[PDB]
Every structure is written in structure tokens, then in C-alpha cells.
């Protein structure tokens, strides 16, 4: 059974944990609980193959910018998350994307751009802007809501397919 | 800084902030439940980096601040009927229903231990831990 080491990165409060827990436990927490370090394992079927997802939820607080480099190295695929509500967190995806590429010494890095908090009505980031940023990186883009579970499966399923394709 | 790193069952881990007064149980209940682990099916250990033994058991209500800067491990109690699922391709000739979404299930997957039957697009909704009293 193939294991897949996934890492969820992004600004604090964009929904990395809400997304992951919606994946692992089918529940939705609407509370504030800034993460420091959280690792999850769960089995998932993808294109017929049962595989093992090992997900690391990272801290978006910049108070933890030092443990970042080490976990980015071991990780095989990355979910770069931003909230459609926060423009800063959208522009900061670049900061995270360059930080990952330094430790992986390549640009064929398995990555998926994720737009969370799609339920809310105050959408400051347009689909087209995000598709443009994804085409700019040559990676997929996927809109999600941890509240309603929209595209939560799709986001992780697509990261795994990126790993398999890059694995060749 | 006032944190504890806790290794968890099935090779998972967490770092928790220790608010003053909390027990290890109060610090760890969510991280265990959010992984589908019942805290009642678990013990918390202090890892001993200098011993014949790898770890010594602690009381769950032990005050957590008493262990800031140690490395803790949570393990399943002896022989608890929890395990990891064992999935298999299965095709259902007879009408079957998905245990997750109750729609018809034609071409899916089943655990070979507990029997959960599901659609691929429902697999993330299968509970993390396989329960077995067989
Ligand atoms: N309405 C709505 N709220 C969401 C959504 N996703 C996350 N939230 C809310 O956003 C807040 C923080 O989410 P959280 O998952 O903790 O984000 P994070 O990116 O893991 N934060 P941190 O980096 O500090 O650990 C919580 O109030 C949570 O309920 C979503 O899709 N919709
Ligand atoms: Mg978090
Ligand atoms: Zn910046
Ligand atoms: Zn099972
Ligand atoms: Zn189903």
C-alpha cells in the first residue's frame, strides 16, 4: 500500500485544519484553534487503489517560521491554501510556494492551489485570478468550503494524482 | 513554548498548548476524538530515553504543566478491539447500498474485517478505525 506524505500550508486562519478534519472525521469545527503541529493518517480509495494518506497540518502563524523548512523537505505533496475572504493570504501563497521550492530543489513539485471559505458571501478573490496563478505555476486549482465539504475530497484526490503523475 | 509534543496511536502526532490547570486528558481529548480514537481506549506514557523500559504509564488526570518539555506517547490499551481497515475491490451483483450515503452500490469497496461497504467518493467518510469483536 503506497503511503503519501501530504503537507497543508497557508496563512493562519485560512482553514487548513477545518479542511483536514473535514477529511478525516467528516465533521466541521467553527471554533478558533490555531495549530502548532498535527499529523493525521487515514486510508482513502483513489482511482481504485487504496492508499494511505499521511497529512501534516502546519501552523500558519509566522511565530513558527523555523520548523517550516524541515517538514517541507520530507513532504511529497503540498496543498497551498488561501481564503477567498483574505487577499493577503492569497498573495502570500507565493511566499509559501517559493519557500517549498527552495527545500525541494525543483519546480516539478506536486502542488495544488486551494481556495477555501467558498460558503461566505464576501468573496474578494475571483476564480479567474486563482486559475491564472495556478496556470502560472502549472498546478491545479480547486475551490473549497470546509463548512459544507465542497471539494474537500477533490482537493486531496487531485494532490495524490499530481504525486502519481510526477512519480511517472 | 509552553507546549507538549505527543506521539499518538497509528504513528500520528500533535503539539498542544498547555493552559494552566489542564490535565493531560483535557489537553488530548480533542486530538484523539478528531482522529476517531476513544480516550477510554487509551493510555498516555512518558517516554524514557534512559531506561530498560521505553515508557512509563501516567495518570490521565495528571496536570499537564508537570510535563512541559517531556515527550509523551499515547497508546491503545492492551487488546482493544480497534484496528486499521483492510479494503478490497468488490463488485455487487445483487442490489447493495452504500453504508455512507445509502444510494445504490454497484461497484465499490469493502473492509474485509468489519464489512463496511462504500463508494470510492464516500471512502473519506468511512470511520478511521476498524472495530472488531469477531
Ligand atoms: N465559514 C467558514 N469558516 C471556515 C471555513 N474553513 C475554516 N473556517 C473557520 O476559520 C477559522 C480558522 O480555521 P482553521 O481551520 O483553524 O484554520 P487554520 O488555517 O488551520 N489556522 P492555523 O494556521 O492557525 O492553524 C475557524 O473559525 C473555522 O471555523 C469555511 O470553509 N467556511
Ligand atoms: Mg490549523
Ligand atoms: Zn508578504
Ligand atoms: Zn474495517
Ligand atoms: Zn456512497
Author numbering:
A (entry chain A): 1 to 168
B (entry chain B): 55 to 188
Give passages from the manuscript.
The interaction of membrane-bound active RAS with RAF is the first step in the activation of this pathway. Active RAS recruits RAF to the membrane where RAF dimerizes and becomes active. Here, we present crystal structures of wild-type and oncogenic mutants of KRAS in complex with the RBD and CRD of RAF1.
To understand if oncogenic mutations at G12, G13, and Q61 positions in KRAS have any effect on KRAS-RBDCRD interaction interfaces, and to identify any druggable pockets at the KRAS-RBDCRD interface, we attempted to crystallize and solve the structures of G12C/D/V, G13D, and Q61L/R mutants of KRAS in complex with RAF1(RBDCRD). We were able to obtain well-diffracting crystals of G12V, G13D, and Q61R mutants of KRAS complexed with RAF1(RBDCRD) and solved their structures in the resolution range between 2.11–2.87 Å. Since the mutant structures belong to the same crystal form as the WT KRAS-RBDCRD structure obtained in crystal form II, we used this structure to examine any structural changes in KRAS and at KRAS-RBDCRD interfaces. Structural superposition of WT KRAS-RBDCRD with all three mutant structures shows similar interaction interfaces, suggesting that the two RAS-binding domains of RAF1 bind to oncogenic KRAS mutants similarly to WT KRAS. A closer examination of the switch regions of KRAS shows minor conformational changes in the structures of oncogenic mutants complexed with RBDCRD when compared with WT KRAS-RBDCRD structure. The presence of a larger side chain at G12, G13, or Q61 position results in local rearrangement of side chains of some of the neighboring residues present in the switch regions without perturbing interactions at KRAS-RBDCRD interfaces. The side chain of R61 in the KRAS Q61R-RBDCRD structure points towards the KRAS-RBD interface and occupies an empty space surrounded by KRAS residues Y64, P34, and I36, therefore not impacting the KRAS-RBD interface.
